[PDB]
Design a protein around this ligand. Sequence first.
Ligand SMILES: [Mg+2]
Ligand SMILES: [Mg+2]
Length: 1205
Amino acid sequence: MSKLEKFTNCYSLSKTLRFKAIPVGKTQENIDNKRLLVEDEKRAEDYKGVKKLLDRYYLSFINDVLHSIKLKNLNNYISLFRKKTRTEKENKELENLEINLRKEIAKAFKGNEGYKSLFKKDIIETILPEFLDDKDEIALVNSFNGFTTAFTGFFDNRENMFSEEAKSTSIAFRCINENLTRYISNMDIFEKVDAIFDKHEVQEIKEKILNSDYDVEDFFEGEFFNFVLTQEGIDVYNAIIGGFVTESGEKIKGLNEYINLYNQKTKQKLPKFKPLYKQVEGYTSDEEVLEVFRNTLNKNSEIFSSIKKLEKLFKNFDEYSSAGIFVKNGPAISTISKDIFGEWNVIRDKWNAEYDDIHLKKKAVVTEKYEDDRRKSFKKIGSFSLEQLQEYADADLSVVEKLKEIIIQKVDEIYKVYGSSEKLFDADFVLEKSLKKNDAVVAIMKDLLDSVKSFENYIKAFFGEKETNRDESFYGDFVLAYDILLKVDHIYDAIRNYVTQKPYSKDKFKLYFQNPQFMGGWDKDKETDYRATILRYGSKYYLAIMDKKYAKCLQKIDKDDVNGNYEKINYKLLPGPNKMLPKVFFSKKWMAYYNSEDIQKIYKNGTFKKGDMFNLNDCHKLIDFFKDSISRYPKWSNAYDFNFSETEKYKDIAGFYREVEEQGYKVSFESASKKEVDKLVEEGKLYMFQIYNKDFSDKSHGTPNLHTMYFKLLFDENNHGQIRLSGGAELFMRRASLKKEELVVHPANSPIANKNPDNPKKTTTLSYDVYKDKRFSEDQYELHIPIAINKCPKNIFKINTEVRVLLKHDDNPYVIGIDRGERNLLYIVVVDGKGNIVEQYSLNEIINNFNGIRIKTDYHSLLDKKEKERFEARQNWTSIENIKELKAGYISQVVHKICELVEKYDAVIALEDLNSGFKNSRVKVEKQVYQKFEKMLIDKLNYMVDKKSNPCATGGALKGYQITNKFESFKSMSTQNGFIFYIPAWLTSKIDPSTGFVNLLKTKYTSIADSKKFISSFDRIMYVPEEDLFEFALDYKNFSRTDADYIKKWKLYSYGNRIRIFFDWEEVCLTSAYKELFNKYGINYQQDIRALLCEQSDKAFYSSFMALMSLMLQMRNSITGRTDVDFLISPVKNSDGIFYDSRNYEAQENAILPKNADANGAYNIARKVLWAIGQFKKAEDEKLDKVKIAISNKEWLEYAQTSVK
RNA sequence: AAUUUCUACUAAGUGUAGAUGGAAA
Ligand SMILES: [Mg+2]
Ligand SMILES: [Mg+2]
């Protein structure tokens, strides 16, 4: 019994099969002549109108009820706010009061004013019919009367407002947390500067025309937050704050405009006010897109005006609070420090040195826990004041002026891009081609939007995310510009969603066939309400839909031996036993059914539920009553063979309900007459589609598609309970999106060309036609049928624990490690329990295995061709989607080459944990693709099943494994999942496998003094001429930052040659390199010569020497221009003494050490997983559920150096 | 370049190999 063989039938799972429904016979002419489509197609197209109406009524309800709202807890909390609470267990009651407040204010919506006659059928039945004015506004709704469930997901998406889900999609969350901040802040700035706007010019002119009472004064004061919760009140507030129109050409100016003019003194520097928020692009026609672009991005657009305004703001950057202004800490810092100071990692280093000077004493060598806590303290830092950067700099470094410099440079680049694009902004310009094919009207669009969005992405940093005092005179105008510049994001993402849109179109609308309950269930008793059924004639399945008013025309039909009989499918599975059993047995129906009192007593107690320790009679009483009622309730026992188990096996009620649902699935067949249903069809009393995909057609011979297998297995005589038809299928239609004047086709007998070079046959000559995108050039009725794999599971138990358990008790574990690479998309090595490379290879060549003869199809050469294609495509918005699809079509053909190894070896998988990786900008599989892969691997491994195997055995369509829990979220991937271990990826490639050596030195030039310190740090530098190598001895106790290594001492060498970076490319041998660096500078070298070295003092030697020493510790030599020279080398001796040169292994069937540097990566990942298994084999069976797997650098190096001796 | 759909195809000729959870927003 292997490990996998136990994992089976673990927990529920739900998939959804899709199928094309071909209409057959004369049902097409039937649905046409009776016009059963256009009613629905219209029902779908105006459904957007009903959405508009529902939105409008919801907003009216919100408005009038928030005219009927008041708030109490604010008057104390606003004062608590400006108090400078500074935590100290006094803002926790702030959190409590604010959460409770957001609760109670949303208690109007969630609680009262109806809200129940809002989300049932009641809405379009009574309310929207009532609340209505236009004849067409009712022509839509009254038409939708009957199909009220078509808003189901729409209804649920409307719950998000009336709750307190702590997200901007809520009512109180927007109108409270995006309101209280701004309202209180504006009232505060009012109390500060309410003395500049005098009475007789602004106050009275805002007094009279607006409200005639509480004119302007009471507005900002205190509790008036209650009145800004409506829409007209908040709108008049937001007009006061910005300016009014007074319904004529007066244009009376607002308070903030008054303070804006008040810089005539040129020294007010008085910040600007801010209104409140409130909750609730083309892509349809070409010229519409072009118009949107030219109208919302031209020289008179608000986006460009805001760019100009923020540029003018940065014209005054220097004269602001050089210490109250903050950049937000995070990824931006990494490039801001690169551009200001010059080097990519300056600010990080400065703060690292500071926190070392503060929290670290003068101890000789740092430790890994201290470094980790320092990085955590760094991430914990909120932001970085510009003044901290002033001191973080060297002298004479104007951080503010450098910032102004780079930012004005960006903006002038924007201007230049505009100057290139004037031809497209000229209102007298016209388009010439189809925008999709056209490029000049897309290449220019991209050159423009890209620069603009890069500026928006670069300036976004200047927030500091929620702080103390800042230059509100700066941030005011800043945010006023930024909230407008943000829209370029949406405009960009709606132009790109069009220049990439496919030529066909998958717009579909759902059929109903004049039945609100269409195809809702598969039940022989309520078929008449559902009016949907399946047939079968051998190996071809059929769907049958009769009509509205003949619903019984599939009942009185018997086989008759006419040499042809359509079968049938019936005999529903049991619905909701846990809850439909109580309502089917406690439905008042005791009037003339039985005579007992104890059963009723323990139900009135509810003691047969939980809340009792244990009872051998209490719950068993309910159970025996149910089982004696099912034997006498003649509507079930007649159908189902109720064969229960014995009484001693029972221990709970959940097991009982599980057993019931197990005994509630008895699908079977009835017969029918072929000519009978045929005449039913011809008479237009039965519309009968075949269910079909490219497998059911006779001419198919190869292996079917997994979902074909699932469907076929839905009716096999082995599908005991595994794959059951979760009722509620639907039936869609989608029009022909291609015009028949556009179709393209390789004509008959024309010898076509074949794209994959490995395929030897270089042509092909079909004797018919190959219509490119045919399936979209015609109507196509497709239907969806859900299923539910393993509805009644047996082996209920946590998986993460039992994989650990089975690992401990196991003696020989296997481990599959996967890691990316620069010359391989994904490299696989699989190791034994002891550290042997059992198998290694690359996955650049997925080898399809069909009909015995295998054809290999590359996937890296393909990706390189598509990339070189992007390189010369002039706009690459559609040549950058093709690659993001090919990759995501290559991590769906490696899932099989992995769920092959897992079955073949009964192993675990080792995946890099992306949360802690730094991939070097040249790995072929970018992070966003790999992150998808891990999700597309958890999902397959969730129900791993082979297609070429026995549908009955283990590992087949009915008994596939479940060896990994349901995927939760991209970030919830940590440290284990079923048979997948999310292990980090530090020091995983630059490490020799034969020794465990690593290079922890800091081998770049800093200063001749530091150079001499590093040189003397060594132990012995003697050019031993017996092998003619330069042996270097070193103790990692000498150099700092070496808290990782464990051997801590090594005898380096100059063995062999290394490859430069220099971009040029230059092979060099290290021995002769040291020879020349000794002779050319004249140091007698046949001897330790460390002292002889430090005699030199020129920067023209040590600088050139430190780089050569870096060249000594490479271990990752490569061309960067050719895949065929990529070798890993180790300048440290093994037990023998010979070094590790991967070239020695490439010409070997199955080496013992990794062949390519990539393979080294997967090897070291698998070894981390092995260390995890080891740590599993030390604890106790009850303590395996706590063992940590986060193999820190120290422990990892300990393992990777002690396990090899 | 044929597909419930996606990807790579031509895979011995109306198709082959993998994968696929859809509807709503
Ligand atoms: Mg197939
Ligand atoms: Mg294709």
